[PDB]
Amino acid sequence: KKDFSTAILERKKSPNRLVVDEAINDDNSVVSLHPATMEKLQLFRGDTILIKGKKRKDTVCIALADETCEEPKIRMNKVVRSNLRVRLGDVISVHQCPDV
Amino acid sequence: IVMGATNRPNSIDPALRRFGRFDREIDIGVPDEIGRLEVLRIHTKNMKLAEDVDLERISKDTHGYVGADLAALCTEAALQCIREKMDVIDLEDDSIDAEILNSMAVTNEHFHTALGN
Amino acid sequence: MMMLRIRSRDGLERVTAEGAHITVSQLKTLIADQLQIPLHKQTLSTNRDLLLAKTPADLLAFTDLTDPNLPLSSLNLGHGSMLYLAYDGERSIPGAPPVTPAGSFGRKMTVDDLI
DSSP: OOOGGGOSSSOOOOTTEEEOOOOSOOOTTEEEEOHHHHHHHTOOTTOEEEEEOSTTOEEEEEEEEOTTSOTTBOOOOHHHHHHTTOOTTOEEEEEEOSOO | OOOOOOSOGGGSOGGGGSTTTSOOOOOOOOOOHHHHHHHHHHHTTSSOBOTTOOHHHHHHHOOSOOHHHHHHHHHHHHHHHHHHHTTTOOTTOSOOOHHHHTSOOBOHHHHHHHHHO | OEEEEEEOSSOEEEEEESOTTSBHHHHHHHHHHHHOOOTTTOEEESSTTGGGOOSHHHHHHOHHHHOTTSBSGGGTOOTTEEEEEEOSSOOOOSOOOOOOOTTOOOOOOOHHHHO
């Protein structure tokens, strides 16, 4: 069994949320994923996605692909991560924006 | 008709117990086993609960409890039942599954845990 | 079955078609029947500057995809391909997730603020 006295705080795994870490590209509106993530999420090249972070903060960024990126990581640059009020090793959800 | 209410009749003004003002004094004491059983049966009428609920055991185990404390115990049991299901419900999704919402029922173990707490 | 992305001034949408064997006319018919966009307003192109025009004549000037006769297979369209659709007027693309406004954190009221 498990101790459920603190059963609310822990996150739940989902194919809609990934982990945040460093990247290479340094454009203010780009984030680099792995193509397997796009295949799982049914996302394609050049799509503009919505990123939701801590304390009800969110932004819009263009998602590109690279083989170097790992599937459970998002490779978020420093500027966007600062805007999301997060640090490397946290959980960030991803969605798609239909209206540019 | 005037109906007072207090906790210790000694602490009231001694001049209010004279003939004609407050001449009847009734002592609503702590209920016994059957009283606690009836209070629990009254309070758990609306809650969903499985057939395993053993209200007699809960009544016997609770000693020194009053009606308010038994209402608190029932609320604690319901909250414990929700908390045990919390491990599968996701707070980010307000669309809780309908079958999940109707698959939650309080049992005897949750009552025992709430009594312990 | 092939999925084609449709970029417009309002944003981005997607359409599922039988395949690349159909022509631009069939693609326009499917767009009309699915996205409810009238035929007389739909203008297709491959350049990103199509949405930068401000006149239906300018939209039709991009004849790389304006002509309905041209087959879609000849354009090398595939799964997840990019197309640009321009139409008269401005619409709200469905499927928009809720977005919180900027600065709406910490609505700490006070008694003095109430006064």
